Amino acid sequence: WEDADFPILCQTCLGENPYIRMTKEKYGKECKICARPFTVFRWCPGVRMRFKKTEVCQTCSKLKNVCQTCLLDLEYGLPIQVRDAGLSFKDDMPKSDVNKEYYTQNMEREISNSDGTRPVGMLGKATSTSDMLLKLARTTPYYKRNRPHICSFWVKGECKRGEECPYRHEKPTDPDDPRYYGINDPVADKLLKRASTMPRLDPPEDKTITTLYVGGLGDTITETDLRNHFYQFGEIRTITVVQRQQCAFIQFATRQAAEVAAEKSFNKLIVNGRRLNVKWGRSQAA
Amino acid sequence: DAIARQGQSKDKVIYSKYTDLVPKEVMNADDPDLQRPDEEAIKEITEKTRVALEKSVSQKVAAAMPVRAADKLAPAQYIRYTPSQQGVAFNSGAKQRVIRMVEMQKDPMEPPRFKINKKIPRGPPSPPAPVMHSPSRKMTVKEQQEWKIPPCISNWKNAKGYTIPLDKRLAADGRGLQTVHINENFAKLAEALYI
Amino acid sequence: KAPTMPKPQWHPPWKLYRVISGHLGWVRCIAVEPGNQWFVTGSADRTIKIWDLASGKLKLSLTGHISTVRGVIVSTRSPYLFSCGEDKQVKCWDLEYNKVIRHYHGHLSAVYGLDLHPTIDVLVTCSRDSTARIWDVRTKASVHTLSGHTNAVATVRCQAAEPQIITGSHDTTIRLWDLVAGKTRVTLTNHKKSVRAVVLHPRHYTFASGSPDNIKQWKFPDGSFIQNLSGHNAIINTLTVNSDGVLVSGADNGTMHLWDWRTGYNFQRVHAAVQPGSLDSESGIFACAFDQSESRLLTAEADKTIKVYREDDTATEETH
Amino acid sequence: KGEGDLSQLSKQYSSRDLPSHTKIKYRQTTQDAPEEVRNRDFRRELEERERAAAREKNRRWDDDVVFKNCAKGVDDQKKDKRFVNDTLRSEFHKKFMEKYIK
Amino acid sequence: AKTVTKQRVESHFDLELRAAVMHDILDMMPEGIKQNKARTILQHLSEAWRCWKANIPWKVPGLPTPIENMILRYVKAKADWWTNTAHYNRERIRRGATVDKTVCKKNLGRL
Amino acid sequence: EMEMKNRQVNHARNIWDRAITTLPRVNQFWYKYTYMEEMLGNVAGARQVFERWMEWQPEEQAWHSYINFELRYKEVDRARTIYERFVLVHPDVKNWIKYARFEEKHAYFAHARKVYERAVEFFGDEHMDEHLYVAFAKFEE
Ligand SMILES: [Zn+2]
Ligand SMILES: [Zn+2]
Ligand SMILES: [Zn+2]
């Protein structure tokens, strides 16, 4: 039912080698979600690494901008649930077999035969990105995804091969922390990790820190851009720009709006292509 | 026009306006827009259509009946695909990444692996063009009463309603009629025997 | 004072000169050789028979259909003919041995009509369920199935110039297809009562359509409503058109009507009487075709009879 | 890209679907091939053919009996050969109903 | 699909006849809002055939002429097929072609 | 009418416009959409819907309903503008006598003489259609 020429293949599954050899089939395995006969391709990424043939088909990868074999996004290198939780639009897809699954899957394959270049619904909302998901976007990822799965007979001590067993050895797995939408167990801990980062400890008073020491101005930040980026938060009382240290001083009437600026600018407010420097003001008349 | 053209790649939904269902102006001998083209154009488009359906039916015969001794392929080709999604430090030096593509041999001792038994309802078809009939008329209150039907007074129905009113019982003229019921030549027989 | 009134071309009228009545079962379709020898027809007698054109004698009959025969056609490049009917079978009748050699099958319902391409060895067939299908000669495999309708498809024509396939169906629409890709090119929505007859002319463009209500006229490139004709309000079945400009429409009430190509003028308005066995209202024209000289017209009606018309060499039939 | 069951999705090597008659006989020049169609008149030939076909048909023994002479066999003749397609009144049905039953 | 064999002869001709009269009365009735009460003209056709089999003259009043005379020509076409099959299988069981109990016990009532 | 019964108006317009561009020849879809717009404001998009509704050539029942729509908001110039294309389609005497309606609305004097010229030069050249001069003499009296 499905033929292909080349799969999606994000970089963490290609391997460390730009020179890999790959064999192909015409009708290979079924997808583990919808059982569609795609074309499984097989290659060797590394010398200590398993083959990682193919998990899903091309069509289900073209719905949500997903790679081919490890089920992560191509645009970041993240799972699907983090992506549509950060963008707050799920682009729903059924769960059963013959109820509504293959119906809308065949129709979305039928309407996407022209382009084959972009996903069906994420083309308009993958543009307003790089704000909340750029904070965890791992460059040069760990190659432990590519290492082979654990073998038996070393857990029981029966392995006659010894060192020439190609899979792994001396790796005790843990039965406490290991599909398409939900639910994923370590991903909940990853959302707890991004919800429990390392900010500055909030001093115990009643919102008196309305000043803020922001610097790194140079020639990109100007006064009108900064006061219009503060104007969407609210109104000023006394603002200034100092150029001997390349810094700006802003305050607010009732602190809370600038408080989310404190949520916005903990090495996080990225305007004009620069990681700005932010530390605390005095708020003490010192 | 895009309201009725939805999803299509610039098809012929330009019918959607009123101005192309009026009768076109009278043509008598206007050769370039009315006459057929030359033999060369119809022959070249016939050759294109013939080689298209010929390669289609050749793929069909080498797909429906492929059993008799076909070679697989000669997979000596490479493919070069630029990693233009992530690479700034991902696999440092990955700039266009040419790889090797061969084909696995399918042995001819295999049944069909995947159960081709799925049945789904037919999905949404091509989107409906505008309908653009003549202005719809309604006749009277009496001709609509003329174009109706009485209920069925059948003997065997095995259907909705056997439908007994007080009337509609004989369901005929009189169930038997001869238009004169007799001939007088009977008399020209009968008394002629009697005398 | 009327528009396009002074300029119709004067066609001489058609008149009866022989009738052909030998069937036992409703005769349905008429095809004729390009070699002007005989003409083939089928019936609900389940016996396809051919008739000599000049002498009128029965050349031969042949049976083998399980149901009625709803279409018959003969090829020009090849010495054999094709037939089809409601027995879910399309038979390829050889003419060198008078036997079936291919026996096309694969249609999920009954078969209404069929047509051949004039240049290449493909065939198009319109059926009853929802589809028209392409049969490849020398392969007898379905290359393309044309699935875009919601009802039965009455007639089908195909030619060498683009666009190829014209299918008029019982869901009150026509559509013109793409023979290569299989998807449709254009859909045509008019005719509150369904379309049952389309025909190629064959000299220049502007093909015509056929329906019971306000019979129309179309165009090959991009689609174009050229003209609608007068009040031919009977329910119709057949259209046949001549190269010199005369056209004939065959209906279900026995009334067959002539037209012209220059204007759209109804000329004769002739009605055919019944041969003795038929009752008062049984006559319905289900087939009509000209000769290859186009000097003789012949129709197959619902009275199990083929009526043959010739010209009239008079002069006093002028247009008002 | 995902055709029907006839193309690839089935190994049903079915009966009646075989490469039989895998060559097409072409109409050669002695028959009514289209090269001889593109130039022949078709009109004078049919006229001379129908004109050639129209001329193809060019006492003291029973003095005591009651009925001495009926004088008529059918009262005109026995040659009608007419056609009534009403199947209850056709003469083939009359022979069917006078021959097989008695 | 499946072909028509010798058993689905009478169970296919009736289906094609009711489909033909269906798309004929769907394309002959005028612009009123109701077509046929979804089965009634089929019931009149079937009752006209049953009345022809008993030779009841079938004079129903208050009925339009085109639907009743198209029912008359359709039951006449079914009568032509019926008698032309009756003559054929009577000749076949006369000369000894088939020995079928169904064909003979059907041809008894079909004569 | 289900989507109209709910408070969602955007999806309602998104189904009304494809309904009326799918089936132009029916009248009830255009009628109920314009009635929903009667419940809504009198914005110029309603006038775009009404000029599309003029564009498909309906019968008299639509066109004099639209001129009654133009009367029920007191439009003098635009109702005069849309009414010139009215007479060229239907030459009905009921419309010939009601092309002379600005006489009984605005009294239109010099252009009333021009409209009466239009009433006297067109069809009815030798037979008068036995009704136009009655209303002409009625207004002249
Ligand atoms: Zn899948
Ligand atoms: Zn991957
Ligand atoms: Zn081991």
From Swiss-Prot, chain B:
Spans annotated as Disordered: 111-135
Keyword Ligase: no
Residues with PTM Phosphoserine: S84, S92, S126, S134, S136
Keyword Transferase: no
Region (SNW): 76-195
Keywords: Acetylation, Host-virus interaction, Isopeptide bond, mRNA processing, mRNA splicing, Nucleus, Phosphoprotein, Spliceosome, Transcription, Transcription regulation, Ubl conjugation
Position(s), cross-link Glycyl lysine isopeptide (Lys-Gly) (interchain with G-Cter in SUMO2): K17, K24, K43, K60, K72, K95, K142, K160, K188
Disulfide cross-links: none
Function: Involved in pre-mRNA splicing as component of the spliceosome. As a component of the minor spliceosome, involved in the splicing of U12-type introns in pre-mRNAs. Required for the specific splicing of CDKN1A pre-mRNA; the function probably involves the recruitment of U2AF2 to the mRNA. May recruit PPIL1 to the spliceosome. May be involved in cyclin-D1/CCND1 mRNA stability through the SNARP complex which associates with both the 3'end of the CCND1 gene and its mRNA. Involved in transcriptional regulation. (Microbial infection) Is recruited by HIV-1 Tat to Tat:P-TEFb:TAR RNA complexes and is involved in Tat transcription by recruitment of MYC, MEN1 and TRRAP to the HIV promoter.
Annotated family: Belongs to the SNW family.
Name this polypeptide is given: SNW domain-containing protein 1
Source organism per UniProt: Homo sapiens
Swiss-Prot record, chain C:
Broad class of where this protein is predominantly found: nucleus
Entry's Gene Ontology BP terms: mRNA splicing, via spliceosome; positive regulation of G1/S transition of mitotic cell cycle; protein localization to nucleus
Modified residues (Phosphoserine): S21, S211
Coiled coil: none
Presence of keyword Methyltransferase: no
Localization (cell): Nucleus; Nucleus speckle
Domain of life: Eukaryota
Keywords, ordered alphabetically: Acetylation, mRNA processing, mRNA splicing, Nucleus, Phosphoprotein, Repeat, Spliceosome, WD repeat
WD repeat spans: 22-61, 64-103, 106-145, 148-187, 190-230, 231-269, 280-319
Cellular component per GO, a single term: nucleus
Family from the record: Belongs to the WD repeat PRL1/PRL2 family.
Subunit text: Identified in the spliceosome C complex. Component of the PRP19-CDC5L splicing complex composed of a core complex comprising a homotetramer of PRPF19, CDC5L, PLRG1 and BCAS2, and at least three less stably associated proteins CTNNBL1, CWC15 and HSPA8. Interacts (via its WD40 repeat domain) directly with CDC5L (via its C-terminal); the interaction is required for mRNA splicing but not for spliceosome assembly. Component of the minor spliceosome, which splices U12-type introns. Within this complex, interacts with CRIPT. Also interacts directly in the complex with BCAS2 and PRPF19.
Protein name in the entry: Pleiotropic regulator 1
Organism of provenance: Homo sapiens
From Swiss-Prot, chain E:
Highest taxon listed in the record's lineage: Eukaryota
Location within or outside the cell: Nucleus; Nucleus speckle
Tissue expression notes: Widely expressed.
Quaternary structure, from the entry: Part of the U5 snRNP complex. Component of the U4/U6-U5 tri-snRNP complex composed of the U4, U6 and U5 snRNAs and at least PRPF3, PRPF4, PRPF6, PRPF8, PRPF31, SNRNP200, TXNL4A, SNRNP40, DDX23, CD2BP2, PPIH, SNU13, EFTUD2, SART1 and USP39. Component of the U5.U4atac/U6atac snRNP complexes in U12-dependent spliceosomes. Within the minor spliceosome, which acts on U12-type introns, interacts with PPIL2 and RBM48. Core component of U2-type precatalytic, catalytic and postcatalytic spliceosomal complexes. Found in a mRNA splicing-dependent exon junction complex (EJC) with SRRM1.
Domain remark text: The MPN (JAB/Mov34) domain mediates interaction with TSSC4 and SNRNP200. Has structural similarity with deubiquitinating enzymes, but lacks the residues that would bind the catalytic metal ion. Contains a region with structural similarity to reverse transcriptase, presenting the classical thumb, fingers and palm architecture, but lacks enzyme activity, since the essential metal-binding residues are not conserved.
UniProt name for this protein: Pre-mRNA-processing-splicing factor 8
Organism: Homo sapiens (Human)
Gene field: PRPF8
UniProtKB/Swiss-Prot annotation, chain F:
Similarity-based family: Belongs to the crooked-neck family.
Tissues where the protein occurs: Widely expressed. Highly expressed in testis. Not detected in brain and lung.
UniProt protein name: Crooked neck-like protein 1
HAT repeat boundaries on the chain: 7-39, 41-72, 74-105, 107-141
Functional note: Involved in pre-mRNA splicing process. As a component of the minor spliceosome, involved in the splicing of U12-type introns in pre-mRNAs.
Coiled-coil positions: none
Subcellular location: Nucleus; Nucleus speckle
Full-protein interval shown: 284 to 424 of 848
Quaternary structure, from the entry: Identified in the spliceosome C complex. Present in a spliceosome complex assembled in vitro containing CRNKL1, HPRP8BP and SNRPB2. Component of the minor spliceosome, which splices U12-type introns. Isoform 2 seems to be predominant in the spliceosome complex. Interacts with PPIL2 (via the PPIase cyclophilin-type domain); they may form a trimeric complex with HSP90.
This protein's encoding gene: CRNKL1
